[PDB]
Amino acid sequence: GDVSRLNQRNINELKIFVEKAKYYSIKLDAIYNECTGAYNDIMTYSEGTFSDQSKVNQAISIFKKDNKIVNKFKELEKIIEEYKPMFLSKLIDDFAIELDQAVDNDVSNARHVADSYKKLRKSVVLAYIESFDVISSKFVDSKFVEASKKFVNKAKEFVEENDLIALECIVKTIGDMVNDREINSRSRANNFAKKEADFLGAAVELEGAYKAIKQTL
């Protein structure tokens, strides 16, 4: 029986999300580039020797100064909040609290800032996938829903290997599908090529289901 009207409403919701979230990977890269030195310094020099306390203090400053990094995470949260309300809220608060307490010089405290940052950045990537999951799950097309669950699973496995690389690939690939650009199914990576290709395989299946919907419209 014809469910064209429902399928067009589902496509509309997906296209809105993807276009609104299209800078998600660029914005997470900007956090990565500003914080990586500081994160690595905290991990290296947090061994209780105070030998490099000044380096740890400067690394904490990168994460804390002008609330800038916290606000970058809040900007990414504002994109997903419509779709996964309170997904990131707790982890953003836990980071904010650790940053406050890091004024107390301590090796543990700084390590907790670094750990809290790493956990929150991974959750920001997962929140993109969790938002796609919720949108996909409103589709009335069973073949699209089945392909979506597989895309979500392979997306989360890719994240386990590397959060930012997975997010970059997920954002470009779903972008290509909703803008009717043929998905490239091949990884040319020297790191994570197996997991990338597995995810691209699930994306090609989803593109097939999506195109089958579009040809009924």
Residue numbers in the entry: 19 to 235
Relevant lines from the article:
Lyme borreliae produce other outer surface proteins, including CspZ (also known as BbCRASP-228,29). CspZ promotes bacterial dissemination to distal tissues by evading the complement system, the first-line innate immune defense in vertebrates in the blood, through binding and recruiting a host complement inhibitor, factor H (FH). Additionally, CspZ is only produced after Lyme borreliae invade vertebrate hosts and, as such, induces CspZ-specific immune responses after natural infection. Similar to CspZ, CspZ-YA is an all-α-helical protein composed of nine α-helices (denoted as helices A to I).
Here, we solve the crystal structure of a mutated Bb vaccine antigen, CspZ-YA that lacks the ability to bind to host complement factor H (FH). However, in CspZ-YA, the distance fluctuates between 2.6 and 31.8 Å but mostly greater than 4 Å. Such a distance is unfavorable for the formation of the salt bridge, suggesting the destabilization of CspZ-YA. Additionally, the three-dimensional structure of CspZ revealed a hydrophobic core between helices G, H and I where residues Y207 and Y211 are on one side, along with F176, I183 and F217 on the other side. Unlike CspZ, a cavity was found in CspZ-YA due to the replacement of two bulky and non-polar amino acid residues, Y207 and Y211, with alanine (the red highlight in Fig. 6D). Further, the altered conformation in CspZ-YA prevents R206 from interacting with E186, exacerbating the cavity-mediated structural instability. In Lyme borreliae CspZ proteins, the mutagenesis of Y207A and Y211A reduced the hydrophobic interactions and created a cavity at the C-terminal H/I loop and helix H of CspZ-YA, destabilizing the protein’s conformation. However, the RMSF values of R5 varied among these tested proteins with CspZ-YA having the highest flexibility (0.9–5.5 Å), followed by CspZ-YAC187S (0.9–5.0 Å), CspZ-YAI183Y (0.9–4.7 Å), and CspZ (0.9–2.2 Å).
